[PDB]
Structures are given as C-alpha cells and as structure tokens.
Amino acid sequence: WKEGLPLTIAADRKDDLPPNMRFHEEKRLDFEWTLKAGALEMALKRVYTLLSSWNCLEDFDQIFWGQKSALAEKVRQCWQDDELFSYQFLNGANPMLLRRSTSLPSRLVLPSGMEELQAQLEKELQNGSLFEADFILLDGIPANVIRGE
C-alpha cells in the first residue's frame, strides 16, 4: 500500500477481496447503516451550528450529542482537570505511550530560573515515580491542510 509499511492483502477495493474474507450480510448492512446514521447526525449538526459563533469551550456542547457515551459525558465535565488528563495515559484511549522515566529526557531542556522544577523532576526520578509520554515520533511530520486552512 505504501513503501516502508507492512504489506496488505492485494485488493484495491473491497470487491477485489477473496470471498471468504468478505463481510457477511449482518456485518455489511450494519456498516451501511452506520454510514447513513453518521451522515444524518453530521448533517444535522452542520445545520445546527451553521450560524453559531465558535468562540468558547461551551460551543462544543452544540455538537456533543448523539454519537457519545456515558463516559464521554463525564469526560466533558472533567477534561480540564489535571487528574483526568493524566488518567488517559494509563487508562484512556491510548494507554500505550506512557513510560516510566529511568532518566530525564535529553529533549527536556529547562531554562534558567526553573530550578524548582529541576529539583522536582530529579525528586520523582530517584523515587521511581517519574513518568513520561514522549510524542517525538511526530517531530517533523508535515501537517494537514484542510479546506485550504
């Protein structure tokens, strides 16, 4: 599919697949329903927010319905909390990046006047309770251009 990536099945479309790897009727009809149910809810949200001004965090409540869950309602209440932000590195959607720091990262360059943080980082490092989530795989990745923006 792309060079440098793990290889895929030889099928440009789903109709080029082997017939034993195809969706059955109940999977395919559910997949077609979710496209229609997804397009219905997005079109109504496009209409509902067509003239809305997107200037505050409470404007996201205008679209926070339909395609949501019970935990996401709790997330909306508590997303600005520092404990929930830290909770997602262990038990969120992506529990796979957080590593226990055996040393301070070389990219973590503290400037002058921040020796209190340097003392705090060394305190957690020797205690063994220092954890890092390094997103360095995104360094230099070219970002998207969406509708010219």
Contact track, a copy of itself, 7-46, x by CB under 8 A: ------x----------------------x--xxx-xx-x
Residue 93's closest CA among 121, 73, 72, 111? Answer: 72
Q: Which is nearer to a copy of itself, 19 or 148 (CB)?
A: 148
97 touches 89 (CB < 8 A)? yes
Q: How many residues can be counted in the chain?
A: 149
67 touches 41 (CB < 8 A)? yes
Give the interface size with a copy of itself as a residue count (CB under 8 A): 22
Residues contributing to the site for a copy of itself (CB under 8 A): 13, 36, 39-41, 43-44, 46-48, 50-51, 61-62, 64-66, 73, 77, 145, 147-148
